[PDB]
Amino acid sequence: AAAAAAAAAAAAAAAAAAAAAAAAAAAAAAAAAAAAA
Amino acid sequence: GAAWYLGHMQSAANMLADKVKDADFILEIRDARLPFTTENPNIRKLTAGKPRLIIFNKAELSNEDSNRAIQEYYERNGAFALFTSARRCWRDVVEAVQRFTTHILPPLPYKTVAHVGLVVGMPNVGKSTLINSLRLAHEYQFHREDFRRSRSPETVSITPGTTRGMKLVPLSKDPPVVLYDTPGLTLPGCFTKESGLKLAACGIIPTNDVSLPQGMVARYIYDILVASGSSEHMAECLHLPRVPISFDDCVAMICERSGTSGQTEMGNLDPVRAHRFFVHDFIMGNLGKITLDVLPRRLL
Amino acid sequence: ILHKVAQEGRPFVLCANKWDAVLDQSATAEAIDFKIKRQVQEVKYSNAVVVSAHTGMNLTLLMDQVLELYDTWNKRVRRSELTKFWRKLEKSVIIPYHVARVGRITQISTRPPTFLLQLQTKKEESQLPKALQEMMKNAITEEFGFRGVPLRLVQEVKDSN
Amino acid sequence: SPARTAQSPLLAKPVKTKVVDNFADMLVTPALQEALADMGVSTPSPIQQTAIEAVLQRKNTVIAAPHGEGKTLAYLLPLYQNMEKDRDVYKIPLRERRPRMILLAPTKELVEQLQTVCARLDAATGLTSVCFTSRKRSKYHLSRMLKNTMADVLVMDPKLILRLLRTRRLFIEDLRYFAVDEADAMMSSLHDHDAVQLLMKVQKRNQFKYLWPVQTQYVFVTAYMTRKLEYIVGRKISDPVTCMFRQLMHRPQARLRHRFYAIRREPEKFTVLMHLLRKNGHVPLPFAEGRRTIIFFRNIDATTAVFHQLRSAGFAVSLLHASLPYKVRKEMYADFASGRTNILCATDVAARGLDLHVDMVINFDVPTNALAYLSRSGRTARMGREGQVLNLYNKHQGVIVSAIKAFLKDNLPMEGLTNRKADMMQPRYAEWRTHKINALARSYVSL
Amino acid sequence: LSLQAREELSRKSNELQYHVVTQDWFGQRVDDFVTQHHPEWDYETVKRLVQQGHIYRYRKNGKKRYTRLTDRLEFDELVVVPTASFWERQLAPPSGVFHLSAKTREMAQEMVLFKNEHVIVINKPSGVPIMPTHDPLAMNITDLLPAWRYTNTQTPVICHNLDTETSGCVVLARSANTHRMLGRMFVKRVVPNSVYWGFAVGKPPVNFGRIRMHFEVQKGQGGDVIVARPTPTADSKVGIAEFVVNASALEFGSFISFYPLTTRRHQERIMAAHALRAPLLGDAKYGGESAFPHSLSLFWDPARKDVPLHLHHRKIQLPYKNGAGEFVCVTAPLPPHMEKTFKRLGWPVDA
RNA sequence: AGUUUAAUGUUUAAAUAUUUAACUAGUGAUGGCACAGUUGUUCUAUAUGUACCUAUAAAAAAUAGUAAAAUUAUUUUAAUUAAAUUAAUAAAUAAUUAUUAAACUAAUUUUAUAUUAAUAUUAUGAAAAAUUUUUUUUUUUUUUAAUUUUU
RNA sequence: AAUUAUUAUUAUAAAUAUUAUUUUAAAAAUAUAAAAAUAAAUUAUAACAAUCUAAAUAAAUAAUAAAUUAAAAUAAAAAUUUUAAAAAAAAUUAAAAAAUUAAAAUAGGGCAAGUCCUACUCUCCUUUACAAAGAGAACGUUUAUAUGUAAUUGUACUAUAUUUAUUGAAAUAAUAAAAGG
RNA sequence: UUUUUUUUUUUUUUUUUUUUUUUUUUUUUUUUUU
RNA sequence: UUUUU
Numbered sequence A: 001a002a003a004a005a006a007a008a009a010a011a012a013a014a015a016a017a018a019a020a021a022a023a024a025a026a027a028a029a030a031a032a033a034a035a036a037a
Numbered sequence B: 001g002a003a004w005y006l007g008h009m010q011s012a013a014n015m016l017a018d019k020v021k022d023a024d025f026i027l028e029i030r031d032a033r034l035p036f037t038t039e040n041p042n043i044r045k046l047t048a049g050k051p052r053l054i055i056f057n058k059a060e061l062s063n064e065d066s067n068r069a070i071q072e073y074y075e076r077n078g079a080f081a082l083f084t085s086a087r088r089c090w091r092d093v094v095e096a097v098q099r100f101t102t103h104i105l106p107p108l109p110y111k112t113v114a115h116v117g118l119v120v121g122m123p124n125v126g127k128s129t130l131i132n133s134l135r136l137a138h139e140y141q142f143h144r145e146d147f148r149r150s151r152s153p154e155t156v157s158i159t160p161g162t163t164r165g166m167k168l169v170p171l172s173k174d175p176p177v178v179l180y181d182t183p184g185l186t187l188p189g190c191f192t193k194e195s196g197l198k199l200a201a202c203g204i205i206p207t208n209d210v211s212l213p214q215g216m217v218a219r220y221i222y223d224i225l226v227a228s229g230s231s232e233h234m235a236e237c238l239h240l241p242r243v244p245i246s247f248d249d250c251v252a253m254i255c256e257r258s259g260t261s262g263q264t265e266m267g268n269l270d271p272v273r274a275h276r277f278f279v280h281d282f283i284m285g286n287l288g289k290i291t292l293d294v295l296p297r298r299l300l
Numbered sequence C: 001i002l003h004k005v006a007q008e009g010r011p012f013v014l015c016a017n018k019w020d021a022v023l024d025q026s027a028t029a030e031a032i033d034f035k036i037k038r039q040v041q042e043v044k045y046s047n048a049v050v051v052s053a054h055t056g057m058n059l060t061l062l063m064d065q066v067l068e069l070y071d072t073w074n075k076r077v078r079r080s081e082l083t084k085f086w087r088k089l090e091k092s093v094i095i096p097y098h099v100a101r102v103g104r105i106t107q108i109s110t111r112p113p114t115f116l117l118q119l120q121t122k123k124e125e126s127q128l129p130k131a132l133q134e135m136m137k138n139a140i141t142e143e144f145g146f147r148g149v150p151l152r153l154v155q156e157v158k159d160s161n
Numbered sequence D: 001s002p003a004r005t006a007q008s009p010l011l012a013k014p015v016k017t018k019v020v021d022n023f024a025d026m027l028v029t030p031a032l033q034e035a036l037a038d039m040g041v042s043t044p045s046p047i048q049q050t051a052i053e054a055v056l057q058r059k060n061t062v063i064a065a066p067h068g069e070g071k072t073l074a075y076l077l078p079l080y081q082n083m084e085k086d087r088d089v090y091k092i093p094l095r096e097r098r099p100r101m102i103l104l105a106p107t108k109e110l111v112e113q114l115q116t117v118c119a120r121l122d123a124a125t126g127l128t129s130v131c132f133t134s135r136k137r138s139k140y141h142l143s144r145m146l147k148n149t150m151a152d153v154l155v156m157d158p159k160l161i162l163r164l165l166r167t168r169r170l171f172i173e174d175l176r177y178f179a180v181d182e183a184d185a186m187m188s189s190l191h192d193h194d195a196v197q198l199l200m201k202v203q204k205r206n207q208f209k210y211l212w213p214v215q216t217q218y219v220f221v222t223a224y225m226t227r228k229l230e231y232i233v234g235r236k237i238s239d240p241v242t243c244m245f246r247q248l249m250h251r252p253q254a255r256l257r258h259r260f261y262a263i264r265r266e267p268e269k270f271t272v273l274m275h276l277l278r279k280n281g282h283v284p285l286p287f288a289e290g291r292r293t294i295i296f297f298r299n300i301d302a303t304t305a306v307f308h309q310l311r312s313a314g315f316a317v318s319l320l321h322a323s324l325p326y327k328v329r330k331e332m333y334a335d336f337a338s339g340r341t342n343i344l345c346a347t348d349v350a351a352r353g354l355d356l357h358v359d360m361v362i363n364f365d366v367p368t369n370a371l372a373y374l375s376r377s378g379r380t381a382r383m384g385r386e387g388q389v390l391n392l393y394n395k396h397q398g399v400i401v402s403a404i405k406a407f408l409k410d411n412l413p414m415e416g417l418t419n420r421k422a423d424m425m426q427p428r429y430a431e432w433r434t435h436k437i438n439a440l441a442r443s444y445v446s447l
Numbered sequence E: 001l002s003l004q005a006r007e008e009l010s011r012k013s014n015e016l017q018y019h020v021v022t023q024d025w026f027g028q029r030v031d032d033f034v035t036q037h038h039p040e041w042d043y044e045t046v047k048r049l050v051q052q053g054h055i056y057r058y059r060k061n062g063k064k065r066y067t068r069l070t071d072r073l074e075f076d077e078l079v080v081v082p083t084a085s086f087w088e089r090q091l092a093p094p095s096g097v098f099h100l101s102a103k104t105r106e107m108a109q110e111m112v113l114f115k116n117e118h119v120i121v122i123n124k125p126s127g128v129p130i131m132p133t134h135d136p137l138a139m140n141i142t143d144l145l146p147a148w149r150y151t152n153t154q155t156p157v158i159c160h161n162l163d164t165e166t167s168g169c170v171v172l173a174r175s176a177n178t179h180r181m182l183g184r185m186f187v188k189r190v191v192p193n194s195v196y197w198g199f200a201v202g203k204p205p206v207n208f209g210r211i212r213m214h215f216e217v218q219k220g221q222g223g224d225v226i227v228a229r230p231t232p233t234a235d236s237k238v239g240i241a242e243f244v245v246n247a248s249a250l251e252f253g254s255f256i257s258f259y260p261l262t263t264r265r266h267q268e269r270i271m272a273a274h275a276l277r278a279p280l281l282g283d284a285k286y287g288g289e290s291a292f293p294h295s296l297s298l299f300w301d302p303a304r305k306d307v308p309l310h311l312h313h314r315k316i317q318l319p320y321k322n323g324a325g326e327f328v329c330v331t332a333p334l335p336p337h338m339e340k341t342f343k344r345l346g347w348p349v350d351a
Numbered sequence F: 001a002g003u004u005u006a007a008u009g010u011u012u013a014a015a016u017a018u019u020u021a022a023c024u025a026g027u028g029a030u031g032g033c034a035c036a037g038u039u040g041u042u043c044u045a046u047a048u049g050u051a052c053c054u055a056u057a058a059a060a061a062a063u064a065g066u067a068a069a070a071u072u073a074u075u076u077u078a079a080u081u082a083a084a085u086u087a088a089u090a091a092a093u094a095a096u097u098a099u100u101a102a103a104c105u106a107a108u109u110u111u112a113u114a115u116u117a118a119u120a121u122u123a124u125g126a127a128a129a130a131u132u133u134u135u136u137u138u139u140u141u142u143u144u145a146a147u148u149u150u151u
Numbered sequence G: 001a002a003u004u005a006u007u008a009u010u011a012u013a014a015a016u017a018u019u020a021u022u023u024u025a026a027a028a029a030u031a032u033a034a035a036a037a038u039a040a041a042u043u044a045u046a047a048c049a050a051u052c053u054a055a056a057u058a059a060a061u062a063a064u065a066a067a068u069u070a071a072a073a074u075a076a077a078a079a080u081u082u083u084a085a086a087a088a089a090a091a092u093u094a095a096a097a098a099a100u101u102a103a104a105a106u107a108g109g110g111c112a113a114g115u116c117c118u119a120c121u122c123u124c125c126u127u128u129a130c131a132a133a134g135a136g137a138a139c140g141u142u143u144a145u146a147u148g149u150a151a152u153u154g155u156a157c158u159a160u161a162u163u164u165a166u167u168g169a170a171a172u173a174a175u176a177a178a179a180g181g
Numbered sequence H: 001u002u003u004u005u006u007u008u009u010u011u012u013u014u015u016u017u018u019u020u021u022u023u024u025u026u027u028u029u030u031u032u033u034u
Numbered sequence I: 001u002u003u004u005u
């Protein structure tokens, strides 16, 4: 639809999967408050 | 999910009034074997002043003693009453509506308008077949609505559902005594323990099911006729020792056209094939030509 | 020629001239009294006189039809007598209200030779169908005897605000 | 439309919407406010507020309003204001045959009203105006050019001005202001294409540089924005300050209410008119009894047919069309106006921008256009007066009345760039469009 | 809407026109302008009018700029912001313009199957109504409501009115803000969101399907029927359910599960009384005349009114989720009156 | 063992086959003869007339004037890229790209600049509100080359 | 019947000729076909059994842009995604299943116009006609005339009007083409 | 033109009824909204 | 024409 919030994957096991969707000016670029394994 | 109007009739009163507020002569199709169970609850206080043409159908099987009082009762109130065997079909009942207005109609102010007829009654006692017999033939031979009889859509040929608004059947032409429809207001399905017996007894609501087994009406038509005679003559009509002691023997004595898988030495017959017989034969007015209701000699 | 006169508010008569030169074909040349009945829409109710000039057959009776039609071409009905008559129609007509969502034609008044219709507080789609149009005019000419000029111009309007 | 008029000249360029909301702050002189309040005008209407100082400045303007929104004062008032600051401040000499300003006007009954509304401005002291229309031995009635005229404001139909020019009697030499009225139609083949060919001779004089630099202020006032009006203004005139109010324009007024009568038969259109003419109106000076009403006809063949049918039925009906003689048309107007005769069997003469007391317009044939409908209807309710318009639509005009009936309940602009009349516009909906007959079907039945 | 903007144009009201002065207020957010000039409206009462269109507009130029709450003002256009003063009229202005003893404040706390900061789910006793019918007398839920105000929330609001004879699971919202959200969860579903259990007497037709009846409530209690396969289009609304006969007494009863896609009146019981004409056990209002309890080996003494309608609002899938990703599903356990007939039949009552 | 239907078959033993499914009891009929396409039979199904009723056969052109599809040749030597719009009495040019040609002066660096005519070419499609990221589609080979830092 | 093919081409005559074409040593699905139970022939049965290999010989069919791939995870394009990118580590072979890949911008309601449909009062070119004239009209023909819808058609003094009266209708229940949910 | 007369379309001297919605109360009640 | 919400 309206493709929002891209995700630029850097590698894996060194990007934390929360920093993928980072580099987007938002409440991200912080630390995930409650992560799930 | 094709059920009918479902609700207590005593809440369909203040809407029935405004339906009589515009009508002229009230009709009704009842069953002479059920003078006041096939009546709407308001028959007492329904109109009291519009000229009612109250008809009892299937009168040939309803007893004749109770027929006199019920005749002269309304005939004293002024509102008329007509009894018919229905063998001579409604064609004579129609003739009544040709005669039973010429004598009692107020003269029409405008030479050709109508005699707006309000009909009531159970649709399964003769009111439906009385409408859809005069409703179908009007499509061909034409009096009003003035169109070329082509706009009836696919698969209707009749419309007693989902429109039934200003829908009305022109029974006659020069004294154009038209008749309304009254979307069915009777037999609410919330009926009484006993009324369903007398109803399914008369062939009306012929449904005999888990809700009302044969052995519940058969127990009723047997215990209503405790006087054995001219009914045991239907029993004696099939080899019965005249008097039946109770329900076990008479129903089991009449198992000559009944039965199921039973041994060559001990036969275990079927009492339900004898149930329907004893039930459905009384429907035909064959066993006895006797009513069900009590005929209050008092006003109620 | 009739339907044009019918469409001009005028009253009309039919007149089978040269009637004696026919072989006296009553009930055979009475198709003139059938064709004006078979499918002709509103010109029917007309009176088809019969005349022959040389003979004089009915030229006096012909004077009566014309003198009567002009008496029906000018005839006003009391506003009350109309309304107390239409409701008794609408009590018995087989219009199922989907063909005409319109309700009680409130007070049919007669402005001139042809009345007007006023619909029951509808404030909605105005007109009525052709089937329900003539069925109103068929009723009028019967009751009031307007069949002198069997044709009126019925006009419709809603209740304003 | 916003997502439009970008691909269209005269627009995509800002529309001066600077409201000034009162006459004082528009700087109109108190010698003109005293004359305005004398007339009854206290508060500036929407079009006035924004375009009176857009012409109090020398900005060439395109005034566009709805109907009866005050356009006549809008353009005229500040031009008198401007003329007064010419003869007094600059002291630009009057000369003989050289008028300071011309006014145009389509119809003879529109010319005259534009004169008395301008005559009432003798508070703008020195300004003397003369209007002129057809007459008998009328070419011998430019005697009022030989005579006192010196008329700074000369309101006239375009054709008669053009002949005063080409025969060397007028001399636009000193034409300081050049106004046009009801330009929607006047600048088109619909009238004569004579509004144009008059701009240019004026447009080619202020760029002549061998006589004094008289930059003529062009002022166009048009209720309708037609495609024709755009280009002959957007492409030729310099800096046209637009004043379009796109959220009230190309719409009939609010307090005006419409009625649609469906008529099946040719001769039945008459009783419905007399039944409508049973509203029993009679005024002092502005067998059957009608209200204040105009009846608009498809043609002057018919505008007199019904007229005589009405009259011979007992009404005090009047008649106004073009083929009338001079005495009868002058009289038959001065009876309807000024109390008498209460109803006017008119053709499209009365549609074109006329003001009076009328309160009920019968479309004896709903027109086949959106101009021929806004122009008739817009004569009913003017400047907040209530008003009713009745439409006797037929089988043949059913489409246009299938949509008019639908645009009104929504209050939509009537195809906001109107058409079918001035821009005949084979493009039904204005763009490089010939609407498709859509599909994605791809079954293509076989046999 | 086109008429709503008409009366807005043709209303003097008091039309409190509000200038936007050069210094203090030019530049401020509009929701600051309204809230510090009109202290009467709550802020949420100010957002509704400012967004709804019964708004405090702002007028600069010749048109009205309806605005969002964050639009800031202009450089002293004396840009008036008009606010409504006498809304009451054809406008119909927007929203915002005994004692419970113990043995009740305890009784209403054993009827709680699920509570969080946004809802409360209860277990209604079959026979207690929700709306009062004997206006001073009947003990209903709405009179109980100031008992589930656990943690002092503001009087939970009832969300879907379970009927009288219907047992089961109810939802209150604990917050008038949450109640607005929990509307789209009830009306006219497309896929099921709730399970009704019941014991209809008489094995219906095929044990999977969908019921489409077109109800019509004629006052009083007309309760009409399918009359139009499409609709009567005027006074009728349809009620659709996807029934599944989970298990069935061999030919005389069934345990049916209805997933009521719609929200119609007794749609459970009137569609059950004409899925076969086999109504629910103890349904004396619509069926109920076959016999008193329809004549079984159940408790059969008074019967005439003894057996309570075996209908149970069983499970509701709330939209609030849980610690594990699953959406939460309350599972109101059957009353004994259904636990009677389930174990009397040996079925594994799934709580 | 002759009569209006259901599964398998699915280039199948068949370009409709085997079994399933709905009623009539030959003193009146298997072809004799007969009918034919802007029309036969017609128990009136716009069913059937030799394995596609658009019947078949022959001869022909208006028949993509139709998002139709194709349209045969490397190494080259001039540019632009969305712009246009008025139905209709005496108002300087539609615009695009294209082919082919044409002329430097009041008008500054001792700067810079694709203007004109003739012909070829007019269908690449917005509805509402608000308002007075960026330059890339296109490279002769060898090198050369300035935009990088984590929570 | 395309054949050396599902086949007694049977109008007739008939009744004890052994009268001269059918491979294979396995297993599943299927396909035909099959002892026992909730007075009759039936069930369903998707239950034993029974028949249908392989290899050898013979060989067709539709299909085919090619890949350098292709396991598996995972985001990125008016987009619907064929690819590409990070991150992985994905082996041959035969057999059997069909989960995914190779066969239409559709189904259902609610609206409005259109074709189909009927119906004629007014529309157009019908021809087949009939009467009329013409011949001392035993008839054959050639002109002038309005009938049926026969039957096909179509019908929403410089100004300021004009280019449309010119067939009229019907939930015409189904089709078509649109929008709207 | 031709400029004269005292004017003149002047002539002239070469929402629902009627005679606000909905959330599956049992009349009158709830609660949300516009 | 007028009752009702």
Ligand SMILES: Nc1ncnc2c1ncn2[C@@H]1O[C@H](COP(=O)(O)OP(=O)(O)OP(=O)(O)O)[C@@H](O)[C@H]1O
Pocket (backbone or CB within 6 Å): D040, D041, D042, D043, D044, D045, D048, D065, D066, D067, D068, D069, D070, D071, D072, D073, D223, D353, D355, D378, D382, D383
């Ligand atoms: N400023 C004003 N305030 C109040 N009334 C006004 C004002 N200006 C004009 N009017 C009145 O309103 C009438 C309608 O406006 P007007 O006559 O200017 O219409 P118009 O501009 O000719 O109309 P249209 O826009 O349709 O061409 C005027 O004739 C006058 O009576």
